[PDB]
Amino acid sequence: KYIIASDSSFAPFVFQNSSNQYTGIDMELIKAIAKDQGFEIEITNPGFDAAISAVQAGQADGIIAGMSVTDARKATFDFSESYYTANTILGVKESSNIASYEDLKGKTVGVKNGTASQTFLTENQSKYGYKIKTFADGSSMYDSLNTGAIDAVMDDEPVLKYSISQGQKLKTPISGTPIGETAFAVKKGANPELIEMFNNGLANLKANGEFQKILDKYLA
Ligand SMILES: [Cl-]
Ligand SMILES: [Cl-]
Ligand SMILES: [Cl-]
């Protein structure tokens, strides 16, 4: 009944499993909310930009896709309450001694170019006195962490936690720094009852523990 458009490859929020179904925090959450609130949904996964288009054109009713709440997006979208605070966070090998940013003095931290993690590291470099090694892709960065060529990485918390949940022997010794909020969206001025039900469904799932179980599956 309500058409919900999403991305196809944005783990842990939405991704294809081995059975070629789309799963992830977002997929489970919207389904649980629809069931809690008694509406029907059809989920499509045309990709993030295509999902944006479909909602703006009125061919989809809502979008959920690890979507960052920004003032720019508020010009054309109405957002739900945040269901996830996105952080940047430090990652190290299991074996690492590092337990504070102060411990990074003289050490070298890897980061992906063009990211919020890079902004944080660059802005705090004088404060803590680490070197930064910049990478074009995550694979190269984590390869470097593995060989000990860098001492730590800075990355998106849900990405790092998902990888750790999946068995990667990394750890996060320092609490993350908030970079934004994540929410469901409808076209500005459209489908207000869907936002109302999403927020009510979210509150219900938080209150009865079901929300935390979804998060824990992917991030713990
Ligand atoms: Cl809004
Ligand atoms: Cl980023
Ligand atoms: Cl690189």
Side-chain angles (χ1 to χ4, degrees):
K1 168 196 31 202
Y2 290 106
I3 299 179
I4 309 300
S6 189
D7 201 6
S8 61
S9 182
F10 201 59
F13 298 96
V14 54
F15 59 103
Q16 211 177 355
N17 60 22
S18 54
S19 297
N20 290 284
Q21 302 170 306
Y22 289 89
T23 188
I25 298 174
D26 286 354
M27 296 299 93
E28 292 199 38
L29 176 64
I30 194 59
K31 291 173 193 183
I33 287 180
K35 182 172 182 176
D36 177 78
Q37 292 292 298
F39 60 91
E40 289 196 346
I41 57 179
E42 174 200 8
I43 297 174
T44 63
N45 301 84
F48 185 66
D49 288 347
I52 297 290
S53 288
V55 168
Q56 286 304 312
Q59 281 309 122
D61 301 294
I63 177 174
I64 195 177
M67 180 173 183
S68 299
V69 176
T70 72
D71 290 343
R73 288 174 172 173
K74 288 181 180 178
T76 55
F77 288 98
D78 290 336
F79 285 104
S80 73
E81 296 278 352
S82 179
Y83 62 86
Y84 187 73
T85 300
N87 300 313
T88 177
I89 198 168
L90 197 81
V92 297
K93 302 182 67 180
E94 291 271 26
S95 51
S96 174
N97 200 15
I98 296 171
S100 69
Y101 289 128
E102 286 82 3
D103 286 344
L104 293 172
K105 191 177 181 302
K107 307 292 187 189
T108 297
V109 183
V111 75
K112 293 158 60 179
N113 189 53
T115 64
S117 292
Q118 180 186 45
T119 307
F120 176 88
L121 279 187
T122 301
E123 289 283 15
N124 285 280
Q125 184 170 26
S126 290
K127 182 175 182 185
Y128 296 117
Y130 45 75
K131 297 174 172 54
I132 298 175
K133 181 169 178 56
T134 308
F135 296 88
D137 56 78
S139 300
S140 186
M141 183 175 72
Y142 283 103
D143 284 358
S144 182
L145 185 68
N146 192 46
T147 67
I150 54 175
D151 300 290
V153 304
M154 201 84 190
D155 207 349
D156 294 307
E157 172 167 337
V159 170
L160 252 174
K161 289 273 189 67
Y162 175 60
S163 65
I164 292 172
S165 181
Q166 286 291 115
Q168 288 298 305
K169 302 296 283 189
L170 302 173
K171 63 181 183 180
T172 51
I174 310 161
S175 70
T177 290
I179 62 185
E181 307 295 342
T182 320
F184 171 83
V186 301
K187 183 178 180 178
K188 183 172 89 186
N191 297 114
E193 77 285 353
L194 182 53
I195 290 299
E196 294 179 23
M197 290 187 296
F198 183 97
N199 289 342
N200 288 341
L202 179 63
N204 290 339
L205 296 176
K206 280 177 178 179
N208 68 7
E210 295 308 318
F211 183 62
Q212 191 61 36
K213 287 184 186 174
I214 295 175
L215 290 184
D216 290 344
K217 172 179 180 181
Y218 295 97
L219 303 176

